[PDB]
Amino acid sequence: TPVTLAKVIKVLGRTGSRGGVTQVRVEFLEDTSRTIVRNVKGPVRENDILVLMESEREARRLR
Amino acid sequence: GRVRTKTVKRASKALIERYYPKLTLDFQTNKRLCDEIATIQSKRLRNKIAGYTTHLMKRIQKGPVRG
Amino acid sequence: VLKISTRKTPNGEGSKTWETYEMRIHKRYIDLEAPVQIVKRITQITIEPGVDVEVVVASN
Amino acid sequence: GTIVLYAERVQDRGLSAVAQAESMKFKLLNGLAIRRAAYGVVRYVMESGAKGCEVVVSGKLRAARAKAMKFADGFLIHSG
Amino acid sequence: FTPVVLATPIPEEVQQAQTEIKLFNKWSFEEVEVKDASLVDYVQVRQPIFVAHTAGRYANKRFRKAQCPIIERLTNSLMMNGRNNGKKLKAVRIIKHTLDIINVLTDQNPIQVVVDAITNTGPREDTTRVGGGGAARRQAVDVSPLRRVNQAIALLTIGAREAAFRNIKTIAETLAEELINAAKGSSTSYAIKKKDELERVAKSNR
Amino acid sequence: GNEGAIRDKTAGRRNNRSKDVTDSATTKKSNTRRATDRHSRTGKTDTKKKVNQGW
Amino acid sequence: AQHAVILDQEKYDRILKEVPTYRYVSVSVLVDRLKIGGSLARIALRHLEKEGIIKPISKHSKQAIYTRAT
Amino acid sequence: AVPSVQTFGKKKSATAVAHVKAGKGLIKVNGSPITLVEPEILRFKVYEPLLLVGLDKFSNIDIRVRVTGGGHVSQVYAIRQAIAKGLVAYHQKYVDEQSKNELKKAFTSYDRTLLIADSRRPEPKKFGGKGARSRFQKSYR
Amino acid sequence: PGVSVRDVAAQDFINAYASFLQRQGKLEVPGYVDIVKTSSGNEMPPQDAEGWFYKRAASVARHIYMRKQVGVGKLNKLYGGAKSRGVRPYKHIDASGSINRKVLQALEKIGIVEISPKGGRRISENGQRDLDRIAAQTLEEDE
Amino acid sequence: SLVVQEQGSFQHILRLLNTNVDGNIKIVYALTTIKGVGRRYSNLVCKKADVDLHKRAGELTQEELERIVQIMQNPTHYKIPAWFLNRQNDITDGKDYHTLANNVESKLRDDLERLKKIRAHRGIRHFWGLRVRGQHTKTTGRRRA
RNA sequence: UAAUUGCGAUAACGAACGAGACCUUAACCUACUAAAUAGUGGUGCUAGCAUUUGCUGGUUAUCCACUUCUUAGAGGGACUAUCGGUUUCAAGCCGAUGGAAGUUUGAGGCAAUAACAGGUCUGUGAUGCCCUUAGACGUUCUGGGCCGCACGCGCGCUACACUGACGGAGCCAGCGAGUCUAACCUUGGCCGAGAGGUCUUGGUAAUCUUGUGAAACUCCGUCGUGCUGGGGAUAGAGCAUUGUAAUUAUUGCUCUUCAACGAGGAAUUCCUAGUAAGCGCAAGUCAUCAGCUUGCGUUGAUUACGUCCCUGCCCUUUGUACACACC
Ligand SMILES: [Mg+2]
Ligand SMILES: [Mg+2]
Ligand SMILES: [Mg+2]
Ligand SMILES: [Mg+2]
Ligand SMILES: [Mg+2]
Ligand SMILES: [Mg+2]
Ligand SMILES: [Mg+2]
Ligand SMILES: [Mg+2]
Ligand SMILES: [Mg+2]
Ligand SMILES: [Mg+2]
Ligand SMILES: [Mg+2]
Ligand SMILES: [Mg+2]
Ligand SMILES: [Mg+2]
Ligand SMILES: [Mg+2]
Ligand SMILES: [Mg+2]
Ligand SMILES: [Mg+2]
Ligand SMILES: [Mg+2]
Ligand SMILES: [Mg+2]
Ligand SMILES: [Mg+2]
Ligand SMILES: [Mg+2]
Ligand SMILES: [Mg+2]
């Protein structure tokens, strides 16, 4: 099973009608240079570390 | 929220307007200044004021302020 | 502090708003060692609408 | 002898709520026009050096359905 | 350890372990580490404590909740289901007890097995109901470290509580048991099943 | 009297249990009017002369 | 009504030979050896302490903890 | 007399007064030795300052505490406060500063509000519910 | 060093003192003990049966040693607890004024407590004596 | 306390007072399955019979058991107050009894009937299968009979 | 921004009501003025254990001194301060340090203009008109009734146990209240299993009840998963209290009798920190009766620090033949 480590950078905001969801851009630590935006379920600030279970499929707006 | 009502902001204006020599970047003395230099009816309203008239003061130093 | 806690309504209708009146009682005492004269001089005058003065004597 | 009564006129009735209420009562019982009654009561209190005054008349006059009126002049404050 | 005694005497082992190391009930904070990346920061351990009771203001600000010593975080979460609401003294004792049991079994800093089980039972990603139009499908997300710690605590505790319910075995054992099994997950713990079944469904929608 | 009360068949729990329950026992509030609150029913009316003398 | 509440001789023996390899020995443990009920198990704990196999690592009511002697 | 200071500790309601005079290392709470002080699960909450700042230190002093009010927890958190405050007051007048600041540095660096009392307090309930925030159940119909 | 009972934890003191009075024989036990209940806020009698009257008296002693004067009223309340009013909310309830008042009469006959001025019962001068003894005994149990 | 042994000396289930009693239950509580005897009564009767309460029902020597029953039906000779007794002042011979076992069934009946047979309101209320001690019967108790 | 709270934009400029201010309460003062109705240290008089000085108690004035703790007067304190991020470098917002305190400091009191056929003539010797007024719808006296029970709805209490029940043991609050022409709050001593009784007693009260020794909770035991010792409905028999009166059982005690309930369908309530929840207390009512309420302290969390999806409201825009205003 591949694992993937990404450092959160810059809180972009809340999506999801309810609002519990939070869009953030992250940076990989296993070779940086590339960043990707993710949707989160819990509370998040800058410099957190997210286990991307699959390192390549970013999302956008939630309903 | 901590938005100062007009009465505080109004009064700070009036005081910086005509006591810029005297007055300081220091609240503590701006406080005491307010006593001699203006009647106010409550200790709370005075610091509320003097704190803000210090704020306005502290950033006139770094350029003008409209009003 | 004498509290009285009551419904505002004369009747029953409405959300049940409760309201507590209060009356504060302040009591002092000053102990004096003085002759018969000053005592009465000090009791009769120094009076005031609102303050209840009580003078007791006694060893006990 | 343990009880003693002393009457004593008041300094300017024109700043005594109770004074002016009872005046209207009386005014209105000699049947002055509603507004004439109250409007003078305002304009005397004012004269007696008040910083604001205000009168309400609620209830029923001549018509069947109940009404109410504000009569006010000068400055009031209402809170705290 | 340079002995010292005054008027009202202070107990041997008490002088002995305290003044030296600042360790737990009588367990070691040092060594103990968060074996998964992240979770560091969002799991305490150091500063070290004696027992897990504290008048801690971990509430009045958003994230400071993180700073609470994770052993005592665990304990707080032990004291619920209305009948046990409050009752920290009751709880704390279970942990002291629990940690002893965890210890007896498979050696190891018991305070570290706690660390393993927590790290090991929080969902790395999850689902959330999305508008989509009435028939609201399931959109996947990656979950916060904080959220991931919290769920681990709550999951761990619950599974034991329900194990403890209606049976001879005590809170402390089932809690110890739940943990020990959750150290490196073993499909028999209420939490791992729930983690795994949660990531089953999370991966079931992307 | 009391003699009758116990001797009286047609009474006591068994008997009520063995009876169906009225439907009036599960009604609503009944309301009956409230939708006419602002429409005065006196059938009078005041009038601008009599109001103007009053006020 | 489902067996636990006594001392059946062949049981006592089992409570002597079966207890080694018990890495953990508590109240719950003893009932779980398809045998004694809590009461005449709590008595066992103090009596295996008479001499051997169990060291008292933890104390009190509700919770007991013993391990294999060394 | 002898060199001494008096200090206090307050948590919730509980007020723990302490007398810290010069003596031979005595520490008794309410009349009994500190090695008792049950609840006891929390015992180390009150052993805590001693260990924090070196088991010695108390050799030139005595300590008594008197806790009234509060309850079976708020008194423990209160007495420890008065104990460690007590020790710092003593150096403040009798020993020296750098030795005072030494102590206050470890009491702070650890802290469970050991020198400074906790501000928290009950909030008054208000009519309509059994709690300060809680409102009674309602029904619409 | 020298020793006061205050220098011993409750369950270490009283259980040593309770054992003392039982090991001794001078006491006065009521007789209704074994059929009585300790309080109307209770459900079953004491399980110590042969005993427990020693244990209260031992506790009663130590309490009255720890203070100026106290009487039945206070001890009734001290030993009172919750009474399950069945389906209704609990309230505190006072315990039995007999078991206590008779313990007071007992401990006094054996000279560990005396009637007191200002009211109540004061710790005896021979109570001090004999209590600080066994205190110094179970401190010696950890010698 | 003790680790005991016993030969085949203890039997499971044993029958006294026309009812059955489980063997491996502590003898105080074991006794309660008998109608009319509750925990307080059981407890005292045993203390009086000089039995070791630590024991289960089955252990008890047949002598000890026989003794026990004997006190249960003559509580007042064998020194047990009276305020311990379910039927003080027998409203006819006015003695003080402790109705037991099968008898408590019959003496409930006898009482219920004395009321009914005298037409007293309580009786009537019993015959109507209602609540008697004056409880609102609007809301509570509806499944029931 | 909690706020028509401000910044800013600007045919507007500059103000007042309401918001804020204000007031009350809870937090900080070893700074000020004091206290035998609050308390500390010393000293006598004195008990106990040690003795080497010690340790732990007793003593409404045997004396001296103080005000830390308690009390309440006068002041002081905080102004989101300093610093740093972010922002139209604007009002602001966020983070760190410090601080008794930095969510409007926390919680309240006050509260403009206007609306409703809201509720109250059953609070009033407030009141119009109507009805009735001696075989009364006046009033009082005797007895019953508001409690009645196939059943539907709402608020509640207690539980379905082992984070427990039971038994012994530890043993800690705060807000309160109490008797004059009177029988209120009750200590202590006896008697009683208990409820209670009896004899005295302190208090018009920071003085006495009362340290309200409260309950959860803490400890050592017993029971061991069995409707069990969880649970305590229903019911019999006896004692006692309030009251002129207790039957349709006022309440309290005792033995016995030992139900439903094995965590609850669709639905739905409340809540963000000393808060939720658990726990008891005082006060109102009150002769007697709290499963209710108003407050109070004790133990003390999990989870947000978001959004407009549901629901409710407010705002512009927009339509009107409505203005008694969609009833
Ligand atoms: Mg204003
Ligand atoms: Mg205001
Ligand atoms: Mg409960
Ligand atoms: Mg108690
Ligand atoms: Mg008790
Ligand atoms: Mg029975
Ligand atoms: Mg009823
Ligand atoms: Mg002071
Ligand atoms: Mg800080
Ligand atoms: Mg209407
Ligand atoms: Mg009215
Ligand atoms: Mg009614
Ligand atoms: Mg309601
Ligand atoms: Mg208990
Ligand atoms: Mg008798
Ligand atoms: Mg008198
Ligand atoms: Mg049962
Ligand atoms: Mg029960
Ligand atoms: Mg009451
Ligand atoms: Mg009511
Ligand atoms: Mg238009």
UniProtKB/Swiss-Prot annotation, chain A:
Task: Tell me yes or no: is Metal-binding among this UniProt entry's keywords.
Answer: no
Q: Which PROSITE patterns match?
A: RIBOSOMAL_S28E (PS00961)
Any one Pfam family here would be: Ribosomal_S28e
Q: Which UniProt keywords apply?
A: Acetylation, Cytoplasm, Ribonucleoprotein, Ribosomal protein
* Annotated S-S bridges: none
Chaperone recorded as keyword: no
Q: Which InterPro entries match?
A: NA-bd_OB-fold, Ribosomal_eS28, Ribosomal_eS28_CS
* Post-translational modification as stated in the protein's UniProt record: N-terminally acetylated by acetyltransferase NatB.
Top-level taxon of origin: Eukaryota
- One Gene Ontology term of the molecular function aspect: structural constituent of ribosome
**What GO terms describe the biological role, i.e. biological process, of this protein?**
maturation of SSU-rRNA; positive regulation of nuclear-transcribed mRNA catabolic process, deadenylation-dependent decay; ribosomal small subunit assembly; ribosomal subunit export from nucleus; translation
**GO terms for cellular component:** cytosol; cytosolic small ribosomal subunit
Q: Where in the cell is it found?
A: Cytoplasm
Q: How does it assemble?
A: Component of the small ribosomal subunit (SSU). Mature yeast ribosomes consist of a small (40S) and a large (60S) subunit. The 40S small subunit contains 1 molecule of ribosomal RNA (18S rRNA) and 33 different proteins (encoded by 57 genes). The large 60S subunit contains 3 rRNA molecules (25S, 5.8S and 5S rRNA) and 46 different proteins (encoded by 81 genes).
Misc note:
Present with 94500 molecules/cell in log phase SD medium.
What family, per the record?
Belongs to the eukaryotic ribosomal protein eS28 family.
Protein name as annotated:
Small ribosomal subunit protein eS28A
**Which gene specifies this protein's sequence?**
RPS28A
Curated annotation (Swiss-Prot), chain D:
Where in this protein does the record say Phosphoserine is found? 16, 48
- Tell me where in or outside the cell this protein is found: Cytoplasm
Spell out which residues are annotated as carrying Omega-N-methylarginine. 65
- State where the record puts the cross-link Glycyl lysine isopeptide (Lys-Gly) (interchain with G-Cter in ubiquitin): 25, 51, 60, 70
Q: What does this protein do?
A: Component of the ribosome, a large ribonucleoprotein complex responsible for the synthesis of proteins in the cell. The small ribosomal subunit (SSU) binds messenger RNAs (mRNAs) and translates the encoded message by selecting cognate aminoacyl-transfer RNA (tRNA) molecules. The large subunit (LSU) contains the ribosomal catalytic site termed the peptidyl transferase center (PTC), which catalyzes the formation of peptide bonds, thereby polymerizing the amino acids delivered by tRNAs into a polypeptide chain.
Miscellaneous remark of the record = Present with 146000 molecules/cell in log phase SD medium.
Summarize the subunit comment: Component of the small ribosomal subunit (SSU). Mature yeast ribosomes consist of a small (40S) and a large (60S) subunit. The 40S small subunit contains 1 molecule of ribosomal RNA (18S rRNA) and 33 different proteins (encoded by 57 genes). The large 60S subunit contains 3 rRNA molecules (25S, 5.8S and 5S rRNA) and 46 different proteins (encoded by 81 genes).
Say which family it is in.
Answer: Belongs to the universal ribosomal protein uS3 family.
For this entry, the protein name equals Small ribosomal subunit protein uS3
What is the organism field in this record? Answer: Saccharomyces cerevisiae (strain ATCC 204508 / S288c) (Baker's yeast)
Lineage, uppermost ranks: Eukaryota, Fungi, Dikarya, Ascomycota, Saccharomycotina
Q: Which residues of the full protein are shown?
A: 82 to 161 of 240
Swiss-Prot record, chain F:
Which family is this sequence assigned to? Belongs to the SERBP1-HABP4 family.
Q: What is one process in the GO biological process aspect for this record? A: negative regulation of apoptotic process
Which compartments is it annotated to reside in? Cytoplasm; Nucleus; Cytoplasm, Perinuclear region
Q: Which residues carry this modification: Phosphoserine?
A: 18
Taxonomic superkingdom: Eukaryota
Task: Report keywords, A-Z.
Answer: Acetylation, Cytoplasm, DNA-binding, Isopeptide bond, Nucleus, Phosphoprotein, Translation regulation, Ubl conjugation
An annotated GO cellular component: perinuclear region of cytoplasm
What is the additional note?
Present with 46842 molecules/cell in log phase SD medium.
Q: What does this protein do?
A: Ribosome preservation factor that protect a small pool of nontranslating, vacant ribosomes in cells under nutrient starvation conditions. Under nutrient-limiting conditions, cells reduce ribosome biogenesis and degrade ribosomes via autophagy (ribophagy) or proteasomal degradation. To avoid excessive degradation during starvation, STM1 binds to and protects 80S ribosomes from proteasomal degradation. Under nutrient-sufficient conditions, TORC1 phosphorylates and inhibits STM1 to prevent formation of dormant 80S ribosomes.
Q: Say if the entry is tagged with keyword S-adenosyl-L-methionine.
A: no
Q: Name one GO molecular function term.
A: translation repressor activity
Write down what this protein is called: Suppressor protein STM1
Q: Tell me what organism the protein belongs to.
A: Saccharomyces cerevisiae (strain ATCC 204508 / S288c)
Q: How is it modified after translation?
A: Phosphorylation by TORC1 upon nutrient replenishment inhibits STM1 and causes its release from dormant ribosomes.
Q: Which residues of the full protein are shown?
A: 56 to 110 of 273
Q: Which lineage ranks, top first, belong to the organism behind this chain?
A: Eukaryota, Fungi, Dikarya, Ascomycota, Saccharomycotina
Q: Where is the composition biased (Basic and acidic residues)?
A: 5-22, 34-49
Keyword field contains Nucleus: yes
Curated annotation (Swiss-Prot), chain H:
Q: Which domain of life is it from?
A: Eukaryota
State one molecular function term (GO): RNA binding
Entries under PANTHER family matching the protein: RIBOSOMAL PROTEIN S16, RIBOSOMAL PROTEIN S9
Tell me where in this chain the PTM Phosphoserine is found.
Answer: 32, 59, 74
Whether Ribosomal protein counts among this entry's keywords is yes
Localization, per the record, is: Cytoplasm
Q: Gene3D superfamilies recorded for this chain?
A: 3.30.230.10
A GO cellular component annotation here is: 90S preribosome
Q: Where is the composition biased (Basic residues)?
A: 132-141
Q: Which family does it belong to?
A: Belongs to the universal ribosomal protein uS9 family.
Q: Which residues carry this modification: Phosphothreonine?
A: 68
Query: Could you provide one GO biological process annotation from this protein's UniProt record?
Result: translational initiation
Subunit description:
Component of the small ribosomal subunit (SSU). Mature yeast ribosomes consist of a small (40S) and a large (60S) subunit. The 40S small subunit contains 1 molecule of ribosomal RNA (18S rRNA) and 33 different proteins (encoded by 57 genes). The large 60S subunit contains 3 rRNA molecules (25S, 5.8S and 5S rRNA) and 46 different proteins (encoded by 81 genes).
Pfam families found in the cross-reference section: Ribosomal_S9
This chain belongs to the protein called Small ribosomal subunit protein uS9A
Q: Which UniProt keywords apply?
A: Acetylation, Cytoplasm, Isopeptide bond, Phosphoprotein, Ribonucleoprotein, Ribosomal protein, Ubl conjugation
Tagged with keyword DNA-binding: no
Other remarks on this protein? Present with 33800 molecules/cell in log phase SD medium.
Instruction: Cite the location of the cross-link Glycyl lysine isopeptide (Lys-Gly) (interchain with G-Cter in ubiquitin) from the record.
Output: 28, 45, 57
Entry-linked SUPFAM superfamilies = Ribosomal protein S5 domain 2-like
InterPro entries reported in the protein's UniProt record: Ribosomal_Su5_D2-typ_SF (IPR020568), Ribosomal_uS9 (IPR000754), Ribosomal_uS9_CS (IPR020574), Ribsml_uS5_D2-typ_fold_subgr (IPR014721)
